[model samples]
Target: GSSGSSGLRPFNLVIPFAVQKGELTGEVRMPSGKTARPNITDNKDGTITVRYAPTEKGLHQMGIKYDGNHIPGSPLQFYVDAINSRHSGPSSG
Candidate 1:
């Protein structure tokens, strides 16, 4: 290749939470009554992750569990916070 593209910026999706080992666990509810649990992996930067491929584009609820007790007076099902997040529209960046 004689030329390289320089102007296009790299795409990055910053996951808000700093995930960790044993920090989250749960299952996704499918329409067929089948239970699915994602495997969370720990990375070099002390973050955990799980991947899912959604076939249908609609409102789907995933049951997540966070076992980390870093905060006092926190509810047992703290992972629900991820589901409650609201992304109204595109940012004005």
Candidate 2:
């Protein structure tokens, strides 16, 4: 088995929509029950980019909504772990 660590990990969630001219919004719920606003970007390709960093350890949920309607798979669930130098090392690929 191998050990793992965590930190301010960056992530991106792309959501596609049928509308051509509308705004995209999203939020992330941390494991500590805190809500965070992520930086949203319109891809101009019918998709929106949601960028955020996870800082809490455990389960986190993110949601994206357009025109006040939740995306198909809104409130996406993800997980995080504690980060420490002791749990990290170099590896040969």
Q: How accurate locally is residue 46 in candidate 2, as Cα lDDT from 0 to 100?
A: 65
* Candidate 1 per-residue C-alpha lDDT over 1-93 given as tens digits, one digit per residue, 9 for 90 to 100: 223331322111223345544465645544435545545454537444555443322333455456734322111121121222345677685
Give the lDDT of residue 57 in candidate 1.
Answer: 28
Clashing pairs in 2: 6-83
Could you give the C-alpha RMSD of every candidate to the true structure, in order shown? 12.9, 6.2
Predicted candidate 2 versus true structure: per-residue lDDT over 1-93, tens digit per residue: 233444645776676654467766788888767888877777677667778888767777787788888877776787765444465568998
Among these predictions, the greatest lDDT belongs to 2
Per-residue lDDT, model 2, residue 6, is 45
* TM-score per candidate: 0.39, 0.68
Off by over 4 Å in 1: 1-14, 20-22, 44-47, 53-59, 68-93
Error of 2 at 72 (Å): 2.1
